[PDB]
Amino acid sequence: QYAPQTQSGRTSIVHLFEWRWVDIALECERYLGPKGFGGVQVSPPNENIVVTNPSRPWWERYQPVSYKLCTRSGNENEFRDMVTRCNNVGVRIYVDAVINHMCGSGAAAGTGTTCGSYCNPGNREFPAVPYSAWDFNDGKCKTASGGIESYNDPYQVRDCQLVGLLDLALEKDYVRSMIADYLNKLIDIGVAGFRIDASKHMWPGDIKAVLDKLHNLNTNWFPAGSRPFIFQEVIDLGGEAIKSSEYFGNGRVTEFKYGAKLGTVVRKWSGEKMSYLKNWGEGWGFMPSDRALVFVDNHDNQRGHGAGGASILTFWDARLYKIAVGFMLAHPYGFTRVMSSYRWARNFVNGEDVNDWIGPPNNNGVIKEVTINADTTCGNDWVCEHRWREIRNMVWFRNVVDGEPFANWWDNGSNQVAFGRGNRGFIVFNNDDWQLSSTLQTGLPGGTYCDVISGDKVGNSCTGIKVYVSSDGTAQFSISNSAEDPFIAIHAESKL
Ligand SMILES: O=[N+]([O-])c1ccc(O)cc1
Ligand SMILES: [Ca+2]
Ligand SMILES: [Cl-]
Strands 348-349 and 366-367: unpaired
Instruction: Look at ligand 1, atom 5, and give the residue with the nearest C-alpha.
Output: 59
Strands 70-71 and 74-75: antiparallel
Q: 251 by DSSP, 3-state: which?
A: coil
The answer on whether 298 is annotated among ligand-binding residues is yes
Torsion sign, CA atoms 150, 153, 158, 159: negative
| Best of 62, 100, 105 for a ligand 1 pocket test (most atoms within 8 Å of beta carbon) | 62
- Cα 137 to ligand 2 centroid, rounded to whole Å: 8
Q: What is the resolution of this structure in A?
A: 2.4
What is the DSSP annotation of 1-67? ------STT--EEEEETT--HHHHHHHIIIIITTTT--EEEEPP-S-BB--TTTTS-GGGGGSBS--
- Cα 16 to ligand 1 centroid, rounded to whole Å: 19
| Best of 17, 96, 165 for a ligand 1 pocket test (most atoms within 8 Å of beta carbon) | 165
Distance between CA atoms of residues 121 and 102, nearest Å: 9
| Best of 59, 63, 162, 166 for a ligand 1 pocket test (most atoms within 8 Å of beta carbon) | 59
143 closest CA partner among 162, 127, 117, 129: 162
Number of CB atoms found within 10 A of residue 455's CB: 17
Catalytic residue annotation: 197, 233
Segment holding 437, helix H or strand E = strand 436-441
Distance between CA atoms of residues 434 and 480, nearest Å: 7
Distance of CA 269 to the CA centre of its chain: 24
302-305: Cβ within 8 A, 24+ apart? 302/339, 302/341, 303/344, 303/353, 303/356, 304/352, 304/353, 304/356, 305/352
- Cα 411 to ligand 1 centroid, rounded to whole Å: 42
What is the DSSP annotation of 172-209? SHHHHHHHHHHHHHHHHHT--EEEETTGGGS-HHHHHH
- Cα 336 to ligand 1 centroid, rounded to whole Å: 25
Do residues 19 and 61 lie in contact, with contact meaning Cβ atoms separated by under 8 Å?
no
Instruction: Look at ligand 1, atom 2, and give the residue with the nearest C-alpha.
Output: 59
Which residues surround the ion ligand 3 when the cut-off is CB under 5 Å? 233, 254, 298
Phi then psi for residue 484, to 5 deg, are -50, -50
Distance between CA atoms of residues 352 and 163, nearest Å: 19
Do residues 357 and 54 lie in contact, with contact meaning Cβ atoms separated by under 8 Å?
yes
What was the experiment behind these coordinates?
Answer: X-ray
Torsion sign, CA atoms 125, 128, 134, 137: negative
Strands 406-411 and 416-421: antiparallel
Vertex 216: Cα angle to 212 and 222 (nearest 5): 150
Q: Which domains does the chain have, with CATH numbers?
A: 1-403 (3.20.20.80), 404-496 (2.60.40.1180)
- Cα 155 to ligand 2 centroid, rounded to whole Å: 9
Distance between CA atoms of residues 397 and 11, nearest Å: 10
CA-CA distances (angstroms) from residue 364 to 63, 354, 368, 394? 21, 22, 10, 37
41 closest CA partner among 338, 384, 334: 338
274: phi > 0 → left, psi -120 to 50 → alpha, else beta; which? alpha
Number of CB atoms found within 10 A of residue 121's CB: 22
Distance of CA 230 to the CA centre of its chain: 13
Strands 416-421 and 425-430: antiparallel
In a 10 Å sphere around its CB, with 0-12 CB exposed, 13-18 middle and 19+ buried, how is residue 138 labelled?
Answer: middle
Instruction: Look at ligand 1, atom 7, and give the residue with the nearest C-alpha.
Output: 59
Eight-state DSSP code of residue 360: S
In short, whether 133's Cβ falls inside 6 Å of ligand 1 is no
Strands 352-353 and 39-42: unpaired
Ligand nearest to the Cα of 235, by number: 3
Eight-state DSSP code of residue 474: E
Distance between CA atoms of residues 399 and 9, nearest Å: 6
Q: 133 by DSSP, 3-state: which?
A: helix
For the chain, what is the total number of helices (H) and then of strands (E)?
A: 8, 26
Segment holding 477, helix H or strand E = strand 474-479
In a 10 Å sphere around its CB, with 0-12 CB exposed, 13-18 middle and 19+ buried, how is residue 62 labelled?
Answer: buried
Distance between CA atoms of residues 446 and 194, nearest Å: 43
Q: 246 by DSSP, 3-state: which?
A: helix
Segment holding 262, helix H or strand E = helix 256-266
89 closest CA partner among 36, 33, 42, 40: 33
The answer on whether 201 is annotated among ligand-binding residues is yes
In short, whether 163's Cβ falls inside 6 Å of ligand 1 is yes
Ligand nearest to the Cα of 136, by number: 2
